Each structure stands twice: as C-alpha cells, then as structure tokens.
Amino acid sequence: PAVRISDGNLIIKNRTILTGVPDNVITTSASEAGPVEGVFVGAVFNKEESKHIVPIGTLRNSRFMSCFRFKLWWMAQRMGEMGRDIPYETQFLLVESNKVYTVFLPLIEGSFRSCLQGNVNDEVELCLESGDVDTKRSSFTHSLYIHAGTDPFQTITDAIRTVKLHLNSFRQRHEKKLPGIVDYFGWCTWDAFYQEVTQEGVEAGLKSLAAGGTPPKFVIIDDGWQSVERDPIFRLTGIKENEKFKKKDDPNVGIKNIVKIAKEKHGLRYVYVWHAITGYWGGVRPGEEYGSVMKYPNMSKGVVENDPTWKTDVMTLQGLGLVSPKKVYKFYNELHSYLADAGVDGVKVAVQCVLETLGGGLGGRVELTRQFHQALDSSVAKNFPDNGCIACMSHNTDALYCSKQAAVIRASDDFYPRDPVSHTIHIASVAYNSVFLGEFMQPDWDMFHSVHPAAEYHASARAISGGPLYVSDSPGKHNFELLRKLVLPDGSILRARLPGRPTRDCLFADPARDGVSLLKIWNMNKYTGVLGVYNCQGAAWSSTERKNIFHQTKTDSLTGSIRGRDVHSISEASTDPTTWNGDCAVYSQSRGELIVMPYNVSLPVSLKIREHEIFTVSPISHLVDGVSFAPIGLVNMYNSGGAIEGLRYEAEKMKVVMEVKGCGKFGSYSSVKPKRCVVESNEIAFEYDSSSGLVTFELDKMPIENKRFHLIQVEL
C-alpha cells in the first residue's frame, strides 16, 4: 500500500518516517477517485471543539523543508531534521528519505482548516481550527494528505491533484486562464508615491519609462486612489475614486480620465487598480448599503506565536467594518462595475488573509473566506473577463484550497527598497514558496526598482520567475540598460513557462541559513531551460527575535556548481528526447561565455552575498557526427531562450529552422562554422567563435506586418 500506519508507526515504502502515532489518528484511501496512492489522515476526539491539536507522530533524523506563515499574510522557508524545528503555522511540509520524498498537505475539511506545528518532543502536530466558537467538530477524516514518490516536484503535483479531486473547490495553476498582463512589462505606483499617488503621477511614470524605450503595457494604480476616511485606521467611504483621480476641469469625470490617458495617449493595454478584500484596510464605514458592521480580528495561537506584533496591530485594535456576506457580491459588483465601465481591466486584491480572523459567528475562517472569494470571483468574471485578479497578502490554505479561478498570486512579502535585510530574503522566499503556491496559481515575484544596489539581483530573479514583470520606479529613476535586459521595444517580455523553483539540490538545504550553499532556481522555456544562481546567505527570519534580521556568516564567498540536469525538466526542451544524451550548451548571461557541458559534468560557480549569475541551458542536438547545435536566444536578455518560439532540425539538409521573437543580438551553439545564416529569406552577416562554438547575428528590428516572429534558417 506504499503509505501506511502499522504498529504505531508511519511507514513509507518500508521506511519508518514517524514513530508513536496515537491510537485515535485514523487513515483512509477513499475519496471520489476513490482509491488513492497516498493516505488521507484525520482523528477522532472525545468532545466537540472549535479547536483541536493532535500528534501525528514523532519525527527525527529525516531532512524536511517547510513553508510556514511568519506573518498572517505571508510564508517563508524553514529546513530541519527533527519535529521540534517544524514551525508553527506550517502549511506545506516535504520530507526526504535517504531517493524518496513525502508531502504532507494539511487541508481544509468542512468548516475547519488545519496546519502543522512541531513540539518539544519532536512530534508533528496537526492543528485543526474553525475560527468560530459556534462551529465545533469531534472527528475528521481528510484533514491531511500524505503522498510519496521519487520525483519531488511530481510528487507535489500528484498530491495536489488528488486533493483537488477530493475537494473540487480549486483548480490547478495550469488549468486556469492567465490574464494578458503576464506577457508585458508593467509599472506599479506603490513604491513610487505610496498613498500620495495622483493621476498626474500616474501619467508621469508611464511617460518616463516609455521615453527610454521600455514601454509598460500595464499599470497598477496601487493603494491611494480610493475614497477613504478616519472615524488611526482608514475605512472606505464610497466606491469611487478620490479627488486626486478626478479630471481637473469636469470633476464629474473620475478614474476614467487616467485610464483614457494611459491607454489612448501612452499606449497601455491594461489598467489595474488596488483594493483590499474588505474594501480598505479598516474595511468599509459601517452602514446599511453593504451591511458593514464593526468586527475585531480574532487572534489564533500559531499566528501570534510567530507574529506577536499582530496582537497590537491597528487592524486588531481598531477593527474593520466588515461588509455583510449577504451583501458582499453586491459590494464587489458595484465597485467593479464602476471600474470596468471606466475602462479598468483588473484588480490587485490585498489584505486577503484578514477574513480568517473575522469569522466570528459567521461559520468561521473557512466559510467566511469561501463566501467572499465566491463573490469576488463572480464579480471578476463578470467585470474583468480577461481574468483580471492578482491575489495579494493571501498565503492561507483557506484561500488556496478555494482558488478556483484567480490565476496570479503574490509569492512573498513586499519588495522593500529601503530595507537592506529584505533582498536576500525576498529571493529565498519567492523561490521556496513557489514550490507550493505555484501548484495553485502563477507566482508573482513582486515589483522592484531598476535603480538600486540590488536591482540586478531582483531583476534577474523576476526574469526567471515565470510571473509578471513590473517595476515600481519613481518617474525618472530608471536604469534602461538593465530594463532592456527584461523588456523589448514593444513592451513584451520573455516569460518562462513554469513557476521558478529551487533545484532538487536546493530543496532541503537552506541557502539563507546554512552558511554553505548557493540557491539555484530553475525554469523552462519551450526549447531551453534557465538557471539562476544566488548567494542569499546572511539573513532570514529569526525564531528568537521573530522578525527578519541579519546573522553571522562564515565567509563572504561561496562556491557551488551547476549541471545541465539541475534544470529539472530540461528534457522537455529537447526536440528528440529519446535519442538525447543529456549534453547542454550553457551560456553565462553575465560573463557572456558559452560552455559545452556534457551530461552530469559540473561547472563551479562562486558568488559573494547578494551576487547572482544567470545561465541559459539548451539541449544540444547531434545532427551527424561532428555537427551539433543548440539555440541560446537573445543573449543580452536575462531569459534569452524565451525568445525561441519554434525550432526544427533537418539533418538531411544540415539545417536548423527557427522562429524567434524580439530583436537584438541572437546567439546559438554550433560545432561547426555556419555556411549561411538566413533571416526572412535574406542572408545576413554573423560572427563565429571557433573556440566556444558561439554563433551571433543581429536581429535588427522587431518582426513587422504578417510576420509576428522572425524566421531564421542556419545552414551548417
């Protein structure tokens, strides 16, 4: 049966993973399916309670990785090998047996949500909570799912899918419609003006970016456009824009003014706006219209253990006007109808995890979350039918397991331009949280600044994230040399196809805390892989201080290495995987060096703290003995291989035929010097380094007219 409890142990393919499983912990393999590869786990208790905790078993001497909420809104990573190091509010746990990987997914069941936490005795406890004193249960059968396999990424995905088939209450990332903003450069007003944003500031930012040749095609009008008032917390007073967004003649005209300027005058395709899941930070001003009533956040133990300041946050103490569940659809619809009729294409929806703290006597955290998201999704589908929703501050399983439609999720805590501790931590967080969040939605690695000491560090990460790419530059503060590595002259980006994630290598070694390893992040394009390597040692969240701090490091520089197969799915980029020997052409985007890397050969990589390097990794095709080739792409862009749309080898003609998007310097590996390089039927000059095999030529202009991609032929 693979995964079983017998004696009082949890045994996984004949390895004891946990010992000392209580008698009252019960397992099953039924569901809709119903027979299922892993096991659902639950428990039976003596009394009704609105909260239970129960040990599942004792964990020692097995490497784990977990994603845990260090704050209400957000996860980060913690590695370890003893149950006692498992954090409070662990939402995802992956265990290694030394070859075999086991995932533990704590679930929502009925009105309860579960997570895991470690205790002093090295037990893994499941914590089940309804968040409502009137909602009480005593037995549970599907509050946790455990599944094992030999490919850690495949293991995760198969488990999520099994759970989906059981709950039917979410979709997987790959089944959802991504909104069109993901394929374009954007700009977000948040770090540029904070709440003092005005419509003139919006226009200024768009114009400055476009004037340097990297034009955004979406904008996020972030927090500060809405009509809010104090009663020191602010609450929503109406659904329309404030005075800063009213045309300065004609104050009857509203946010439609800036939207039309953006799109007709500056060429934007999309405009999004920010709002809280509750309207604003303090909710909506109490009243009949939407049934808003003052409510005060309930504290749960796990959240407040990791985040003690939450007990004295302004939202906790001054409360929120919570719109009624009976009127929530109407609130979202009236807000979104106003927005859509003004030309707005989507919303960035923040403050999402507050609902779990307000389910009071409304059925609790799960039911309240489900209700609000049901209404929000209906409103988004009606009013922003490109699927215009970015989920923000939303890392709770209550929202993840009801993620049926929305397709983009902020993968971490905010970019912080002025906080030096944050940069290394940001890269670790987005990468590790993406392992799990990217099963539900496309991860958004957040805005950044192009003029900043960490700009390249952040920029390169976004380029391999698989997610939307956007800066929050103040108008005029741009580095366009850096932005041209991310954005083409029409505002399109080279987006990779998957959530960027750590390599198998990096899943159980904490590169923020171990003092010894470099973080390596992989993604895929259609005909190449990509790999970024980061030193992010020297800072992380503190179990003792309970916030992000710097910590001692043994040295500045670390040396690790890369292999072609670190790009876990690199196979899928090969045009003939069954004959492929595993050799890759590896192009260092930062050094500009092409290296041939045979299957399993390592290359050493050395980096100091806050340094990085990006490598495009392309499968080599052996056309005949001595004639071998791999495309690289737009070598002056971070995610070079994202430019290759089509690739075909004709060994009988010793030819390669490609479809390439974009413009700039194009590169490929060839063992031999080409006879000819042809672009749309004309022959063009090229360079060839005989020593590395690097072929380069210039793609002068974007494709015009009926072309849409450059058609390139390379004759060898």
Numbering used by the authors: 5 to 102, 120 to 252, 265 to 749
Sentences from the paper on this structure:
Interestingly, superposition of the two galactose moieties at the catalytic binding sites of the wild-type AtAkαGal3–galactose and D383A–galactose complex structures shows that the galactose moiety in the D383A mutant exhibits a chair form with a slight distortion; the O1 hydroxyl group at the C1 carbon is in an α-anomeric form. This particular structural form thus places the O1 hydroxyl group of the galactose in a position nearer the OD2 group of Asp447 to form a direct hydrogen-bond interaction with a distance of 2.87 Å. Except for O1 at the anomeric C atom, which exhibits a conformational alteration from a β-form to an α-form, the positions of the remaining C atoms and hydroxyl groups of galactose are conserved and make unchanged interactions around the catalytic site compared with the wild-type enzyme. In the D383A structure, two additional water molecules interacting with O1 and O6 of galactose help to stabilize the galactose moiety compared with the wild-type AtAkαGal3 structure. To confirm that these two residues, Asp383 and Asp447 in AtAkαGal3, play important roles in catalysis, we generated two single mutants D383A and D447A by replacing Asp383 and Asp447 with alanine by site-directed mutagenesis. The TLC results showed that the hydrolase activity of both mutants towards raffinose was abolished (data not shown).
